[PDB]
Amino acid sequence: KKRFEVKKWNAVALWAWDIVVDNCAICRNHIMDLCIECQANQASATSEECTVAWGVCNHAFHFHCISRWLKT
Amino acid sequence: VEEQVSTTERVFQDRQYQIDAAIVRIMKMRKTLGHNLLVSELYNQLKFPVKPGDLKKRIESLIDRDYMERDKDNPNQYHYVA
Amino acid sequence: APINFTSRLNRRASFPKYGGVDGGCFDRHLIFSRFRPISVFREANEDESGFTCCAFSARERFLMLGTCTGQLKLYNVFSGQEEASYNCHNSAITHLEPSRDGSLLLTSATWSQPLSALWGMKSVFDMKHSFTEDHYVEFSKHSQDRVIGTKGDIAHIYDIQTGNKLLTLFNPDLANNYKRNCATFNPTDDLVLNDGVLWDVRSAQAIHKFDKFNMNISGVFHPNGLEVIINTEIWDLRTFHLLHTVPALDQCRVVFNHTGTVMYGAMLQSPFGSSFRTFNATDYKPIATIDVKRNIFDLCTDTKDCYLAVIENQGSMDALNMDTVCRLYEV
């Protein structure tokens, strides 16, 4: 009784391990919080410049608290 | 076109990451190493070589974050920080 | 409200579900107080056994047992026949646990590196990941793609798709330094109990720290999502209030069954006790002590609460003069 009717629908969604992963493997602290070294003028006074990165296993982490181990 | 712009930005941002991760991943095996050698090591370490403009900027930030330091009383001479 | 089976059972005619009062809160004390041995598992081609741990497989087709030598052995759950044998570690296996899907097995050793590892069960017993810092390994309770390892008093949580470490939870000052700390998830996978400390999985800060009642057992979560035991102390995991204490849980490796109605475990200090106990999950009220008269290395129940698989030392509990076999008792 309508001019148009849908018969098929293929919905798409992006999948992430929230997994209470608003946290970190090396750091503990929540990813939207400051990465320890940004809670004080340690790595930087610019606490607002502390960013968040994603990996390849459905989760995120602080940019700084993980990349700091590259020298190690 | 908008999609080409977004993919172009992704390339830029990925290059910007590599030049931040690099340098830190350099020096450790070459404790004393200058700017002209760092760009050369970066040519080989990076997927895409970095211009001296971006390189100097990343170096200064990497010094503030204790990954590298200057030596030999020379703006272009660097040493690994442990 | 009769105590006796005959009266309680006849009442079912007008008072369904069970008849009388209490029901399972009473009847569990008639069944989990009467254990009798049915069968035993031993290593093929060996004279004496060296099992240290066990678990039933995901589909309960076989019992999985770990040896003192770091091997995994799979036995037919019905016949007692060894079907397969794999190497996992170079020393005694402290823990074995399958996923619900049965794709992979979590194993860990008391010493040999990697202390924990992810081994495949489907098709090929290969490795997915080696964890050299994790003494104890365990699956989460709701979402099993996430697995928790224990490094001393530090919790390490990884996703088994690669074994990549996701989050850690620790604090040396809050830590009670338990001898057998085995970090574990709550039923809702948003709290971790690590060395007596309850961790907020959504902030990685401690939410609460429990007193060091014991030195060996850091505690286990109840499936009701309310109670957590720290050796003997029963705490409210929602408010962190103390609710009850049961001394019968002291040195008892108490875990729960599928339905969350039965809790059971072996006694600890070859640091093993010579008996095991069963408890009423309703309130941890002890049901019975089973007089095995053999040092017990480990134990597990099945989904159907039919037989409890207990690893008992029939030898002298020596390093070499030992005979640890897995003897199954019917409830």
Add this chain to the structure above:
Amino acid sequence: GTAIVINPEKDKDMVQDLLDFKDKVDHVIEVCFQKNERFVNLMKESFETFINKRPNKPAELIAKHVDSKLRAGNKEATDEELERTLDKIMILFRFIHGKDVFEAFYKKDLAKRLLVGKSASVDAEKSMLSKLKHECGAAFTSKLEGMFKDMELSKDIMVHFKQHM
């Protein structure tokens, strides 16, 4: 060779023109210079030297040229042609730096092929991933291969969801 790579005005054909020039040179050496190593080894070095003249422009062109052939809409409709063109096009990918350009653009059109409409060929799509791993490292296609895997996983999932529905 420089005349082709140095002029973006013909970008759309730059990959094919550089590949054609490379073959013309190699043909000359094979047939009349008797495959003398002096010219064989230098040919490659000369081409690497000028092919990587722009800020990795060829990588974008490679991603678009292989993706265009691989698109079901107005497809070649044969595997011989899809393989022939993806191979020749992808070969130039090994003469340049900044391979991120390919991945950044490729993954956008790859995502389209894996979600909406069809690819010209599944085997051709997999062939590209194999060609990319070589001379880049397996890590290069880790995300790109994972994208494919997700849809194979989705196929089983959507079946089970209907069963539950």
